[PDB]
């Protein structure tokens, strides 16, 4: 029914042979547990037991079928770290529905794109979110895609009152989900591409992702989860998730977003042994520690997840350090493969690798340009194939050309390097996204928005190194009259666009480098950026900047008066000459102190 | 004979029969290697067996013997890191007579006051040190203490070349060391008041102290240390120090200063197992190798001394982790009182604690205010005496007298707190003294210089937090009119005093508390500003223009919002957002993260922050 590129048969019945695809609904997850009355969901005040929450979902799957939703239809849902998502998700899959969970950061011009490749017959959204707020973007959007039939809405008292079909009981209704081969629903993919591009996932490769994800990571009925991350992505989701959490009897705890503030007080309050997040949200838990916060609110915490981005290795041996429990790096996509470090594996691996495949059948080779196999050192571009990776884009076959050769391998775009114990390293990247705490940006996506503006002739985005987020959008723009960052910032708000697209840093430019279909060339403007980049002072007036710092703030210097009457301390002044050894190597701690001037020190790194 | 404190005649004879004093005279540590053709020191390309070390000794003495210095004199020697140091050391020794090593760092004030006390009948300086570049200052200073007869200087091509004395050969000479219970020569205390205080250190205290020194640091012929701090201070003298190793048939490297980039080169060429530095050279030497210097040619290290100042467990964790040597705290005194942690020890004690005494017999105690002894886990004031902790100071009565305790327990002026175990834990301060990158600086002997300046009234000099020198001098003043950090930096530097005595900081106040007696309650000065400063801490910003200054670094450089433009517009990310929520929580309790992205506007957190 639904269309998604299927697995070649042979394929289909070593991954059933060999017990990976069990031909069973995803409902079954919450199925296991619909007589159980401990705890699945604590959503703030309010905890549901399992048998609620199947029951809920049981009754809103059975309140749409009333208001005439077919199975084999499509939804669009919008919803945050709620418990209404997890109970859409279940009705939707009892009813033979296959959604799309978009973010709730997500704004007019994504939910436009999604609505018009699912051609949705429901649509689920919040009122706490600004387009409904009011119903008039609401009654805009209904017209726009008509295939939407039925609407209800969270935090509505109103009509289309979501709760409304969730409390209101069950008629002669059972459930109807769709078979295991066929599709479940969508994920949405990290953007490589200008229009968006779904992923669509069957009830049997799903299920295997989050079973298998669940031996791997141990949750058990003791699992106590903590979402803070978005809940809709295929990470909290899956890996093992909220969903790995549900299969095994544990029990979410839902917050809004990842802050200490927020946090800390959940994981002492429910007794949190686990949690995922995202490199930029660690920095910020282990700083907030160092400020004060009690290590001892966490000590129910014995495992923290960390993946969708780059985890430096100084950063990840801080975590036991100073948190004091044990770290799992997670290196996946919402296409397939995740690759997990495991939970018996050295503390080598687990600081420096990003570990290995979930599963013994997921293949994966280091790629060279052309397409050849690599040694196992050797860095390259990412294939794989397996049991939950996807064969391809939902009705996208323009794209599903490039994203898969000829043998049904997916490349990700991640350059890796691959351990002679087989663990997998991120080493670079081949795709034009960028990853923003985890985020992915289409870089085209949004060059293509800046190209709507009439003073931008030329754009190209391109990542850019950040201590906290890890990596930040910079757009370089060549212009008719000259642009100011809050203008295009502003600008490209009003395109109605997911508000971390925005470019954190804007540079108007004299020329890019022009390939010969019209498109900035990227590879070429990354490089002579780096180089530029990779350093002692360049102006005597630089020398002063380096200088100031070092002594009393009170007072400034003359050129050529002696810095050590200014404060400057003997300790700091060895390092000074250190750093400029390093270029003029004659220059030692002696040499400066002899006459230590701006002016003596400026004839020196002449 | 020369006047200092004796030990009650009852603990000479402890110590004697204890095996502790062994009545043998100082020389006897270069005396053993006399014919001895392996290298005692290495000085830049330079390098000296101890038959020619102790030679060079012999004709030194020789020499000075010969221009009339008499046994039971005193001198004023002032050399740096050079091995004419060690020399001249030892040519003092064998004559008999006592020098103060003064440090290369002194000037014209402190060298006056240690001339003064002493009256030496011996100068020995060097013209590469300011003051005797020329000949100007040499001049008046001989005039002006007129004991002083014999003057060499190191690298004088002149009359007074003290090259010469040393390689013109030995004559008859026999060594005539003073006693071996009689003084042999004076340490520096850094010194808790304002005239400098010397201390007498007998020929069988000394010898002690460094003998049970190399015992517990197992110092051997193949100990080969490097001494990159002050040659002169007692720890790179007796700790085991230089004189360690010259017992024990090593080798001893000179370098000038400790900094990584002279060091780190002589470590690897000369092969050296161990070396002593204080807590801001570790500081410079660890980063230093993050900065790209090659962890390599350190690996001749096996142990890294660390004293002289507080050293916290965070820095003392990182020595074997990013160096990879083993770390061991040193806690002394110039006037007796060595802790060491022990080689054996474990990593839980070294890196927590200073150690315990070098000596079963050392005594330690702590008193509260009384003198009354406190528990074995209590903080307070440390008490010792023992076979190398000295008796009293030399010449000063007034002092002796506040100093020590009617017992003979001599008094640090150090808070200390005891383990279970019996180590020692350096728990803070009470003498009025600061102590800068491990330099001891007296606050009275800056303060009365500061009151020597026209326009100030009042001065009191305190120490101050500083992340790299771990303590800095912070001068507070009151004033007829105004004056700035550089004219006193600049004013006390014409008064000839150490560059290091420099106050790092100046503060001109309205007021100080006077005591009863007309000086600076520093006790009171101390807690007003504990709390001003901790006050502001947890501040948070005072205004809307104050809480503009801590917005816009977290911005795009490139523009500059109206107060009530969105901030996200500017580049302002929720990461940092949510922590600029979580430190104003601690004020205003009902701001989170979400509140503050409601509405991301200064106005609009403005108006939150002035409830
Ligand atoms: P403000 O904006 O309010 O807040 C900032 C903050 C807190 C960071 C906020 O943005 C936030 O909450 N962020 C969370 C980000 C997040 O939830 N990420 C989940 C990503 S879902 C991911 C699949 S994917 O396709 O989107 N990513 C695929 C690509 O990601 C890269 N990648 C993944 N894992 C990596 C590791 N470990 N190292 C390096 N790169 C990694 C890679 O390039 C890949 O192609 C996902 C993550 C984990 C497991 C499974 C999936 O599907
Ligand atoms: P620029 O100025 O060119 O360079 C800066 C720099 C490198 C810091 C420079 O000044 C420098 O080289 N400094 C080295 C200082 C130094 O050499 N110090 C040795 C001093 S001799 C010391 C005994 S004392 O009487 O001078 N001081 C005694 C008091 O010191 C405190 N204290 C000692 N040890 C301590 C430890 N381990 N922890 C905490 N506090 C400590 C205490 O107040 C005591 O009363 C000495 C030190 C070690 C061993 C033996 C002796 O004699």
């Given at each position: 029914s639904i269309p998604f590129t299927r697995w070649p048969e042979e394929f289909a019945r070593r991954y059933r042979e060999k017990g990976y695809?069990?031909?069973?609904?995803?409902t079954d997850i919450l199925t296991r547990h619909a007589?159980?009355?401990?705890?699945?969901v604590i959503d703030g005040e309010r905890q549901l037991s399992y048998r609620e929450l199947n029951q809920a979902a049981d009754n809103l799957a059975c309140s749409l079928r009333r208001q005439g939703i077919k199975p084999g239809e499509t939804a669009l849902v919008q919803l945050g770290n709620v418990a209404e998502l997890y109970i859409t998700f279940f009705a939707l899959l009892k009813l033979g529905v296959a959604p799309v969970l978009a973010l709730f950061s997500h704004q007019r011009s994504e939910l436009n794109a999604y609505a018009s490749q699912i051609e949705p017959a429901l649509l689920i959204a919040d009122r706490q979110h600004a387009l409904f707020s009011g119903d008039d973007f609401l009654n805009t959007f209904v017209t726009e895609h008509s295939s939407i039939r039925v609407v209800q809405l969270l935090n509505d008292s109103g009509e289309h009152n979501l709760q409304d079909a969730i409390n209101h009981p069950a008629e002669d209704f059972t459930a109807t989900p769709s078979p295991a081969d066929e599709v479940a629903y969508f994920q949405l993919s990290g953007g490589t591409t200008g229009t968006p591009k779904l992923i669509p996932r069957t009830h049997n490769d799903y299920y295997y992702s989050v079973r298998r994800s669940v031996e791997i990571c141990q949750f058990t009925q003791q699992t106590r989860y903590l979402c803070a991350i978005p809940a809709a992505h295929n990470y909290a989701m899956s890996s093992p998730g909220s969903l790995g959490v549900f299969l095994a009897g544990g029990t979410v705890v839902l917050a809004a977003d990842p802050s200490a503030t927020l946090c800390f007080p959940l994981i002492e309050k429910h007794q949190v042994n686990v949690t995922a997040l995202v490199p930029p949200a660690v920095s910020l838990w282990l700083q907030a520690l160092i400020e004060g916060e009690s290590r001892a609110q966490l000590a129910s915490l014995k495992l923290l997840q960390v993946g969708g981005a780059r985890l430096s290795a100084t950063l990840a041996a801080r975590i036991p350090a100073e948190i004091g429990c044990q770290l799992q790096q997670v290196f996946g996509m919402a296409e397939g493969l995740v690759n997990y470090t495991r939970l018996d594996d050295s503390a080598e691996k687990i600081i420096h690798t990003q570990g290995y495949p979930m599963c013994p059948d997921d293949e994966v080779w280091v790629a060279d340009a052309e397409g050849n196999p690599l040694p196992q050192g050797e860095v390259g571009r990412l294939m794989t194939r397996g049991?939950?990776?996807?064969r391809g884009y939902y009705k996208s076959p323009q794209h599903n050309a490039s994203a898969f050769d000829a043998n049904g391998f997916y490349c990700s775009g991640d350059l890796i390097s691959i351990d002679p114990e087989g663990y997998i390293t991120?080493?670079?990247?081949?795709?034009d996204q960028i990853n923003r705490g985890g985020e992915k940006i289409a870089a085209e996506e949004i060059e293509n928005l800046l190209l709507r503006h009439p003073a931008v002739i030329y754009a190209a985005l391109v990542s850019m190194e950040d201590e906290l987020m890890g990596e930040k959008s910079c757009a370089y723009l060549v212009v008719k009259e000259p642009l100011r960052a809050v203008q295009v910032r502003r600008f490209l708000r009003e395109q109605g666009i997911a508000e971390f697209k925005l470019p954190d840093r804007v540079e108007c430019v004299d020329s890019l480098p022009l390939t010969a279909v019209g498109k900035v060339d990227k590879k070429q403007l990354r490089q002579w950026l780096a180089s530029r980049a990779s350093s002692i002072p360049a102006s005597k007036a630089a020398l002063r900047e380096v200088i100031?710092?070092?002594?009393?703030?009170?007072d400034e210097p003359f050129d050529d008066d002696n810095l050590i009457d200014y404060g400057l301390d003997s300790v700091r002044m060895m390092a000074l000459a250190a750093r400029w050894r390093k270029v003029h190597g004659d220059i030692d701690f002696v040499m400066l102190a002899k006459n230590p001037t701006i002016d003596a020190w400026w004839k020196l790194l002449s």
């Open positions: 695809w069990q031909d069973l609904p995803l007589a159980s009355d401990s705890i699945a049991p939950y990776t996807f991120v080493q670079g990247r081949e795709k100031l710092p070092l002594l009393d703030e009170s």
